[PDB]
């Protein structure tokens, strides 16, 4: 469905993938830096889930900011939960969501 | 009279400007900041339709991203250093509400980002409109990104209120939130006392919207995370339809998770949270009883600050009065303990 | 991130420094822990004569972990 | 090889275990350290009420190093 | 009637064999071991001519590398698991001396490799010749190599005796050596007592050739080193010239290095090392005075074991008579503080 | 006057050479394991000296074992790194001295 790069402090730490059964977040086997979230420890490396990992869902903005973005950009309200790619560069902290 | 940033009384010099130099310094770091923004509200804030109702008042609040170019505030669309919060169309004076509450939290010794009131450029000789501005905490002195993360995602909770089933019941509590926090930050008594006072003052001041995304983790000291500063503290007391929805955003004690059980204060003749309920909260975080007795006494003696800060704030007198019965009523309930 | 305790005095100065960097005063520690303020002052000077349980109690309140190696 | 002390009883149990693997009897520890045997049997089960200096002394005479982390 | 491995009495079932089942088990790990070698001395020990004259007794001892093939010993040329030390040609009965001493050391509780006396196959109906065998300590359970080092190399000392100056004086001492050891092994009291007793017992038993190449560091449990087991422990009392050469291999106290100062016992009427000199050694190691008193009392109680082990050994008597003379003498000196 | 290799636990640690002025021991740049002696820390890596390093000098035998090689071969102690090679496979510990 979709495949996107995940990067922390400007350097890519892993990749977020989406297929038919669900999503898969993956740390690059050569990354041994800090974990992007305490929900996603670096030691586990691979992260499967049918629904979007609660960390990634929570980086999307809501409220007035979700309304102004969705009145002009028609994304699939739920099936495409990757509204993060459109907002990837305006995320809180040191994390960026960038297309391949 | 009072400073639009610090709420402290202005001197003759700074009276006509409306801002003290000591407050302009706290906000910008320079004494010749211009807090009179060079753009109108309708210039950047689009008038969005009211989507449904009965949500959180913050779900209607616009947010603008600001940067400091010299002593001038400038609107950007990418990562900035400030967040500007106008009053929502349906809730006039909300920006003055956050400023009063946030200034109070700062005066009570909590970790609060620098903040204040700025004025929109007018259209034609009308009432000056003010908005709330605040420095982002995910920035350092050099303005370099500091990593952070909100609590709902950390605890892997898919809803900020913990309504994670179709009961509509809440399934995460402030007791459980604190237990999760000490598991991943440093459990010094200083951290626990600050956290316990954050929850008590959210209740005292009428902040029934301290949900899981108004808590944050900052990754400054390498791997060790620390609790983020206080942000998004507003008093809901002036707005009754929202104020009687909940006493707090989340259940207080883990025994109430999902509605399985009631807090002792609800079984008492007072029918709401009382002093006993917050003892059981602190007594679950490891705070010794003699310390909790002292912590309650310090909150009583801080009532001079709470009265003073709100009464000299820039809110409507009807709004200030609403907040001060909420404070005075709930502060009395702190006595019903043991 | 590990510091070898050379002497009992070395431990007291490390804890007292940690206490001051966190902003905790002696009266807060007395209420949380129950060790008197006069004994807490001795603990942070030279805890050679303080009950080991009192030293271990204070270290937990300050977020200090105590490990042993060889 | 690092082990975080959970309770004072934990430290007392490790030190007594260390002592036995070295083949050291209590009388030798009394002669070397000056700590009475009664106080040593005390330390090796729960050193909660034992002076910190003695626990630190017994750890050294047994080759155990004390560390602190955060 | 005494065991050629343990020096304990044999039990009728073992008397004719000459080796107890307990001893054969301890040496080989199997109870079906053949202590009667299948080769003669001259088959593998080729005596070289002249040798030297000023060398220490250890420098004349041959060394054969042995391995255990189905309960039978076989001489290998490189890397064995056992070492066979026959008596040197000029020092008959030395193997029985090393066996007697190292058995005593083992009985006193020191860390000693398993050892014993094996016999060569006869050549022509002569009395059987017995040699000293010992298991190598730089091997583990599966016979895999374990790293080790001698102290002369670790301390960067160019001479076994520390004769590293522009004169004939010694510049390393037992005190200086013990301070080096605690700096690099685990400083626990049990180690300090053992090392102190090794030094006192080398003096008591007449081993005046415990030099820096007779101390070792074993790198077994990770990077942390341990003191190597006792080895090369022979009593030089039966050989008067070699014995009257030195009281020990190294000076006892650090103050003695370079001949700068004398040990306190040298100024006394006894003119040799006495108990106060060994107290000062222990003090420098960090041993409490109350402990050293008890440590000395234990050593007095152990003369029963010292008399017994040597008396039931396989040395020549006039040699046994010599050792007990030196021992009783120096054990008497321990009382003088 | 050879460049001889040292072997600890079966893996090459480095090599010991004899030049014109003196000797030089070189822990291989990729080695980050245990050191063959406490006199020779891994951290220093390079080890020059006028005379034979006190460690390797002590690794050579001295008694009846040395007089055997001094009887057949007998180079009169002219090659200091070149007496270890006669028994490089007869050393105590896990150390080996092997040419090239």
Residue numbers in the entry:
A (entry chain B), F (entry chain E): 2 to 101
B (entry chain C): 2 to 339
C (entry chain A), D (entry chain D): 38 to 107
E (entry chain F): 2 to 338
Give passages from the manuscript:
Enteropathogenic *E. coli* (EPEC) O127:H6 encodes an additional, tripartite TA module, *hipBST*, for which the HipT toxin was shown to specifically target tryptophanyl-tRNA synthetase, TrpS. Surprisingly, the function as antitoxin has been taken over by the third protein, HipS, but the molecular details of how activity of HipT is controlled remain poorly understood. Here, we show that HipBST is markedly different from HipBA and that the unique HipS protein, which is homologous to the N-terminal subdomain of HipA, has evolved to function as antitoxin by breaking the kinase active site. We also show how auto-phosphorylation at two conserved sites in the kinase toxin serve to dually regulate binding of HipS and kinase activity.
To understand the molecular basis for the functional and structural differences, we determined the crystal structure of HipBST from enteropathogenic *E. coli* O127:H6 expressed with inactive HipT (D233Q) to 2.9 Å by molecular replacement using HipA_Ec_ as search model ([Fig fig2]). The refined structure (R=19.5% / R_free_=22.8%) has two copies of each of the three proteins in the asymmetric unit and is generally well-defined for HipB and HipT, while HipS appears to be more flexible. Analysis by the protein interaction server, PISA, suggests that the biological assembly is comprised of a dimer of HipBST heterotrimers, which are held together through dimerisation of HipB ([Fig fig2]). In this complex, the two HipB monomers interact strongly (interface area = 1,405 Å^2^) while the interface between HipB and HipT is relatively small (513 Å^2^). The biological relevance of the hetero-hexamer is supported by analytical gel filtration ([Fig figS2]) and small-angle X-ray scattering (SAXS, [Fig figS6]), the latter of which showed a major species with a total mass of 129 ± 8 kDa, in good agreement with the theoretical mass of 125.6 kDa. In the HipBST crystal structures, we find the Gly-rich loop of HipT forms a short α-helix and is in a conformation most similar to the ejected form of the HipA_Ec_ loop despite HipT not being phosphorylated ([Fig fig3]). In this conformation, Ser59, which is known to undergo autophosphorylation in HipT, forms interactions to several active site residues, including Asp210 and the Ser57 auto-phosphorylation site. We conclude that inside the HipBST complex, HipT in its non-phosphorylated state is maintained in an inactive conformation that does not support ATP binding. Near the Gly-rich loop, HipS Glu63 points directly into the HipT active site while Trp65 is wedged into a deep cavity formed by the HipT Gly-rich loop in its outward conformation. We conclude that Trp65 is essential for the ability of HipS to inhibit HipT, presumably either by increasing the affinity of HipS for HipT, or by preventing the Gly-rich loop from adopting the conformation required for ATP binding.
